[PDB]
Amino acid sequence: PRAELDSTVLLTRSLLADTRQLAAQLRDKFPADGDHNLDSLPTLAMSAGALGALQLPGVLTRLRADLLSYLRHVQWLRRAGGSSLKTLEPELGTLQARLDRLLRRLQLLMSRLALPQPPPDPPAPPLAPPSSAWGGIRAAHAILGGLHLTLDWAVRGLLLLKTRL
Amino acid sequence: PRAELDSTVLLTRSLLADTRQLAAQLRDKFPADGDHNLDSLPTLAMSAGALGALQLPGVLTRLRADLLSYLRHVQWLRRAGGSSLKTLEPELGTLQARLDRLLRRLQLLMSRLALPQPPPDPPAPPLAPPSSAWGGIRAAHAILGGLHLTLDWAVRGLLLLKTRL
Amino acid sequence: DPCGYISPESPVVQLHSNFTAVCVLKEKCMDYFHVNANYIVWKTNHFTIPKEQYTIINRTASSVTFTDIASLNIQLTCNILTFGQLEQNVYGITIISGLPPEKPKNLSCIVNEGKKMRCEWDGGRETHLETNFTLKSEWATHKFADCKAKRDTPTSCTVDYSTVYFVNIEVWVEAENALGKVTSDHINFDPVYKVKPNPPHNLSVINSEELSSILKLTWTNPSIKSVIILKYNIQYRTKDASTWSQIPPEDTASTRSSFTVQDLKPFTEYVFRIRCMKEDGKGYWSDWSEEASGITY
Amino acid sequence: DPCGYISPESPVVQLHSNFTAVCVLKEKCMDYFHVNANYIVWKTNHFTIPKEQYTIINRTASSVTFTDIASLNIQLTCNILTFGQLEQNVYGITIISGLPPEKPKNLSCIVNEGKKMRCEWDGGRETHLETNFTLKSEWATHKFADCKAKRDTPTSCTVDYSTVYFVNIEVWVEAENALGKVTSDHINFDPVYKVKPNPPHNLSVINSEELSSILKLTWTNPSIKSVIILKYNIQYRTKDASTWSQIPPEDTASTRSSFTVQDLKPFTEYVFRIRCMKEDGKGYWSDWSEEASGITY
Amino acid sequence: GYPPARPVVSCQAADYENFSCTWSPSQISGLPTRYLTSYRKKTVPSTGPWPCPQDPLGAARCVVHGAEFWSQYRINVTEVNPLGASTRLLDVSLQSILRPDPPQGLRVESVPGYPRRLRASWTYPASWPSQPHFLLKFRLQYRPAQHPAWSTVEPAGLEEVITDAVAGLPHAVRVSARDFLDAGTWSTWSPEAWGTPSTG
Amino acid sequence: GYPPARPVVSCQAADYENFSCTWSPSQISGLPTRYLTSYRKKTVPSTGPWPCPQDPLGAARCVVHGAEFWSQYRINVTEVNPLGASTRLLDVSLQSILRPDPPQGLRVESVPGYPRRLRASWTYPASWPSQPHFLLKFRLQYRPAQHPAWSTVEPAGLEEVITDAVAGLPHAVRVSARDFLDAGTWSTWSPEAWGTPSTG
Numbered sequence A, B: 001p002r003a004e005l006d007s008t009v010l011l012t013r014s015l016l017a018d019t020r021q022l023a024a025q026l027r028d029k030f031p032a033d034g035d036h037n038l039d040s041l042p043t044l045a046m047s048a049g050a051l052g053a054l055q056l057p058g059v060l061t062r063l064r065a066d067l068l069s070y071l072r073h074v075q076w077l078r079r080a081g082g083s084s085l086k087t088l089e090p091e092l093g094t095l096q097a098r099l100d101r102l103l104r105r106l107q108l109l110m111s112r113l114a115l116p117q118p119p120p121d122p123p124a125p126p127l128a129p130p131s132s133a134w135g136g137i138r139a140a141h142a143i144l145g146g147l148h149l150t151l152d153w154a155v156r157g158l159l160l161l162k163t164r165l
Numbered sequence C, D: 001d002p003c004g005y006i007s008p009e010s011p012v013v014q015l016h017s018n019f020t021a022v023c024v025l026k027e028k029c030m031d032y033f034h035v036n037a038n039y040i041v042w043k044t045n046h047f048t049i050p051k052e053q054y055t056i057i058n059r060t061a062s063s064v065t066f067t068d069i070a071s072l073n074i075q076l077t078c079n080i081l082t083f084g085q086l087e088q089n090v091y092g093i094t095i096i097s098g099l100p101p102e103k104p105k106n107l108s109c110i111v112n113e114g115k116k117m118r119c120e121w122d123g124g125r126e127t128h129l130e131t132n133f134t135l136k137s138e139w140a141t142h143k144f145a146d147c148k149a150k151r152d153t154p155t156s157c158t159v160d161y162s163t164v165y166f167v168n169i170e171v172w173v174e175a176e177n178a179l180g181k182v183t184s185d186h187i188n189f190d191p192v193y194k195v196k197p198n199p200p201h202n203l204s205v206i207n208s209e210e211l212s213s214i215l216k217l218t219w220t221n222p223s224i225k226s227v228i229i230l231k232y233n234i235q236y237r238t239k240d241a242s243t244w245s246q247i248p249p250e251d252t253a254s255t256r257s258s259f260t261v262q263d264l265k266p267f268t269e270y271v272f273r274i275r276c277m278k279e280d281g282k283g284y285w286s287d288w289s290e291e292a293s294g295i296t297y
Numbered sequence E, F: 001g002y003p004p005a006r007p008v009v010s011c012q013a014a015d016y017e018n019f020s021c022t023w024s025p026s027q028i029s030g031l032p033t034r035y036l037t038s039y040r041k042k043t044v045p046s047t048g049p050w051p052c053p054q055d056p057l058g059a060a061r062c063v064v065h066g067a068e069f070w071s072q073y074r075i076n077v078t079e080v081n082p083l084g085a086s087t088r089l090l091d092v093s094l095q096s097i098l099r100p101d102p103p104q105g106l107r108v109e110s111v112p113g114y115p116r117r118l119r120a121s122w123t124y125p126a127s128w129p130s131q132p133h134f135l136l137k138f139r140l141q142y143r144p145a146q147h148p149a150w151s152t153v154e155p156a157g158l159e160e161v162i163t164d165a166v167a168g169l170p171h172a173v174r175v176s177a178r179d180f181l182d183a184g185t186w187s188t189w190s191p192e193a194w195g196t197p198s199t200g
């Protein structure tokens, strides 16, 4: 029942709603036909069924690695997706800004709980630019059609942590 | 009674009024005590008494050389006179813009009258920057406390030209 | 690693015209799914394009032809029937439609005292496309800086160069968008004949003791009086009247800073308002002055 | 090739304080005119400074001392009596005066739905100096971008970062001008408690056929309902009434999108207007909704 | 004869751990019939074909236990007859397909002293085990008898006090459920329960 | 005794070719008296001291002919007695010092058919030779008899029709002159001339 953990869960729930809404808004204007993938996004494979067992270090380590990759891709989109996708601002930019804060919010969490910090990992090389404006939009469905799973798994994962500390 | 000459005289008379007004406005806010000089401005020495005799080539050649130097100095002021003299805008900038057009207006005059054009003269090296913000203002009194003589002598000189062609 | 693409990239077409879109699949993707041109399906804005409008040009490309375009914005998407149950997106393009800009008409400019030249023009039929309006201006041997219209107020610009009276200036506006470029007529004029001075201020009504049927008006003319000779219009009525009366224009055809109104009813209150403009009637009437009240002695 | 100069270059001093200005002549100019310190005359804004206020510190410099500065702007000029008839300008400086900025008080921020965080504060006594206002904001381990106030609206800023609900943010404003720097209190708050949602729209009044004394209100809540639970205030009166009545607040303390108003007079027309805010009363009341009219069956 | 047509497949899930999919023949023309069922986890670990066991060993339904909650699965239902196949492939994500059952035990009670207040209570559905990670949000609707239009509220928790009940009138009340993180879809409406506010 | 005090010097010019300056003793204490007069053109050509000749050879006035119109001149009037000097130095620019004489021959006439119009006419001053380079601008004032406040107009040319004359009343009219390019200063007012608008 930490004071710090309730607040972080609230922002993930807040961010999850923004991401689901933006994904649905995006599909309304630029429909997607089919499951879109990007080789660079992480696989979020972990079963909620067998999710209780996983203790405190794994949830926080996994969220940071997954969320950091997603931040780069959202940030990447606002640079090169093409004029076709300018219509998702400012909603897409607000998501970028709030998502950046949540990654920051997680780093503060690790310091206050005095948990061993992961080693400064080597940043991933740059993503090639999209091959077309529509290629960036198709990439956009994949990037924030995935970002509402990482955040979804964060609310679920963080609620597990509250049950312990 | 050329159609081209009446119009140019009107703009000099227009510009003369703006310059006299700006010089008086300037003296009202930043009084000057004494006759200010700059080594770079031309000496406008020509007597209106013995001014009839001077024919068409001299009036136009003298105005261009004098006015081109004055344009540089006005333009120079808007770059480096100091924040103290920012209060003379936008009136000072309008004078710069209209003065530029009149120099242009004179060059058009020479072409339409098919007069021999002066050789492209070597531009004067740069004026050293003012030693202080107030040094620029003192320089300002000299620059546009002189620019209302060149223009004054232009109206007078151009009216002489109308009497001939 | 897309499967293919549609060409043209992002076309803009004219309303009621024809448009043909071609979707081409890369060979590598075609091998992977074991499909060809006959399996391409087109969708737009969540609407399935009816199969009868498709045209297989070759096994690598499919095409559709739109006629009488009536949508301002058409989102076109190309999808493939890979297993024959699952639809996957190949490519997409956005089709934007509209009209070329109409030739600007009723082009006019105005020089408000103390401000830079401003020009207004009538835009024509709505074009539905982002249309840029650029004010072009040049005197005769050198072209001065351009005005790119702001999204707000698409019919107006305020130049970045100071107004220069007594020189004829050539002005025109060029309207251009993805479907076309057009220029307004090349009107030619001297800004001095397009001035809209500010109205006179410090207007005062004074009660002369002698001749109880006479009132003298005084005011300060606008600074623009240094370049042009002003003409004015003084209107007056009784404090209770519903309509305004007017001094004969011929009596006020030239610059002055005062006027004595006569034949007014004794010890009656009168309200005055004034406006002024260039003596030759070439230009625009200024706005109405501040209201003024007065009472005779 | 000036003759001398005044120091300090361009001072700013506090009202009612003392200021000493020193004018120093270069040696070369002094030789040329055959003068010294006793010949320096001071002038300000066309006013001759009375000789009794001068102080010759040495033959190279003269000084004046101002007490109880009461002018917002003083233009000081130093001149020399060269031949003893002709006055020539040596140097000049501009003296600007004012007050240091007062500590901002009543600091408050507001998050209008769809817009970025905006903060307002009460400026204190006029300072007569160009005073910059900078909104500082930081969460706890990193400081985010600053708001430099615009000349227009000196008491407000709209941040450049998107609003982030559910995280406490430390905010304060720092006011600074040539005479001083000061900071507002370091208030601390969560933007979620400073939201001013837009008012409900699409408000509809419906005439139920059964129970001619009952009318049902429906409307669409503001998007901000996804983060906080809303509370609303519904006011109503008869089409001819002069004052508004109100449903008991306790009956409307939590998010909902409809409400049935009862005990209304039969076949009578009623006008409604609504506003909403965060369920805990922490924040700001929204603006009034669009007006709505209705008639019972 | 002719090869089989594509079978019609639907999946569902009323809880967060296991989900299940069902299929029906689109045509009763192939007399002998059998079904091949399988599924895989699409990537971007042998995630290949895993059998979907058929629960009472004859029904038209298979269940996948211990499914990955956030991953997407491609279910392969294949109809086979002695003459061919017509595999139906159906994409399913546990986070998308989920739909809880309506709340249970909905009761509505008057609130003494307040002639226009009612207290509504209800319980979780039995198919959803109460666990701290996945709550459910609830949506309550109420409507006075003989009136045509519903009013909607979004209660916190398992109870809701209605405050705009028409005085002296029976009220119908029904509720629906959805995963608290907006996963899946809203439940079907509960059976209506009736109550009448107290007098005074 | 004591050295002379600085003399008092004024200059003036009613035309654009020559100008003239005058000086008076500030004190009649130095009995024998003489004046040294000179002037130079300040620069930024022996522009040194040039004598200022005294016209009827005894008066307190010297004239400079063929002066540079736009240049600035520093006039040196020196009082000398057997005991010393007190040179007065006075800066003068022809473009600044110029002041024309009032217009001449001002006449005001009624305008038949218009009971509130008058036609004013006047001529150049004799000290200003009409020449196309330097016109004069004019400023006309009119005032009805017994009234205290003047009305001002800025006529083009040598004539002006007044349009707000009070009917049936004598009007006083006076005018002043200035160089048409706003050089120097406005003239003194002309002598008033009277006229009365026609009846009808």
Ligand SMILES: *[C@@H]1O[C@H](CO)[C@@H](O[C@@H]2O[C@H](CO)[C@@H](O[C@@H]3O[C@H](CO)[C@@H](O)[C@H](O)[C@@H]3O)[C@H](O)[C@H]2NC(C)=O)[C@H](O)[C@H]1NC(C)=O
Pocket: E036, E038, E076, E077, E078, E087, E089
């Ligand atoms: C969905 O599941 C069905 C059921 O397994 C899949 O059908 C299978 O398809 C493969 C071909 O890809 C068959 O392989 C066999 O290979 C041998 C050796 O050449 C040959 O003798 C057979 O005639 C056949 O080609 C396999 O037999 C068949 N399954 C069964 C039970 O017969 C189907 O491919 C799956 N759909 C997917 C993965 O999209």
Ligand SMILES: *[C@@H]1O[C@H](CO)[C@@H](O[C@@H]2O[C@H](CO)[C@@H](O[C@@H]3O[C@H](CO)[C@@H](O)[C@H](O)[C@@H]3O)[C@H](O)[C@H]2NC(C)=O)[C@H](O)[C@H]1NC(C)=O
Pocket: F036, F038, F076, F077, F078, F087, F089
């Ligand atoms: C204004 O004009 C007067 C009149 O000329 C100027 O007075 C002149 O001043 C000079 C000194 O600068 C005198 O020079 C003489 O030099 C000889 C040789 O040393 C000496 O014997 C004399 O006693 C005197 O110093 C000159 O005599 C004197 N003029 C006259 C007529 O005596 C005055 O300087 C001028 N003011 C200026 C230019 O500011």
Ligand SMILES: *[C@@H]1O[C@H](CO)[C@@H](O[C@@H]2O[C@H](CO)[C@@H](O)[C@H](O)[C@H]2NC(C)=O)[C@H](O)[C@H]1NC(C)=O
Pocket: C007, C022, C024, C057, C058, C059, C060, C061
């Ligand atoms: C199949 O048809 C498409 C139709 O576009 C062909 O693509 C064009 O190919 C020509 C080759 O001469 C190029 O010049 C064009 O630029 C291509 N246009 C596009 C939009 O692709 C394609 O080459 C054809 N393929 C075969 C094998 O015929």
Ligand SMILES: *[C@@H]1O[C@H](CO)[C@@H](O[C@@H]2O[C@H](CO)[C@@H](O)[C@H](O)[C@H]2NC(C)=O)[C@H](O)[C@H]1NC(C)=O
Pocket: D007, D022, D024, D057, D058, D059, D060, D061
């Ligand atoms: C005359 O007085 C002025 C007063 O300022 C002197 O100027 C200062 O000189 C000191 C020398 O120690 C410097 O440290 C200061 O920075 C100077 N200040 C200014 C404003 O000039 C000047 O040196 C004095 N001269 C003599 C010969 O005593």
Ligand SMILES: *[C@@H]1O[C@H](CO)[C@@H](O)[C@H](O)[C@H]1NC(C)=O
Pocket: C018, C065, C066, C067
């Ligand atoms: C295609 O274009 C032609 C010519 O522009 C037109 O006549 C025809 O109606 C259009 N549509 C078709 C052929 O479907």
Ligand SMILES: *[C@@H]1O[C@H](CO)[C@@H](O)[C@H](O)[C@H]1NC(C)=O
Pocket: C130, C131, C132, C148, C176, C177, C178
């Ligand atoms: C309209 O103007 C903007 C501003 O520079 C420019 O970026 C855009 O390309 C213009 N649109 C055209 C030329 O169609």
Ligand SMILES: *[C@@H]1O[C@H](CO)[C@@H](O)[C@H](O)[C@H]1NC(C)=O
Pocket: D018, D065, D066, D067
């Ligand atoms: C100078 O300053 C002192 C102290 O600030 C003050 O008492 C005095 O009145 C001021 N003015 C003078 C000395 O003229």
Ligand SMILES: *[C@@H]1O[C@H](CO)[C@@H](O)[C@H](O)[C@H]1NC(C)=O
Pocket: D130, D131, D132, D148, D176, D177, D178
């Ligand atoms: C006020 O802000 C402007 C904007 O950058 C800055 O240039 C100026 O120096 C500031 N004034 C101060 C710091 O006194």
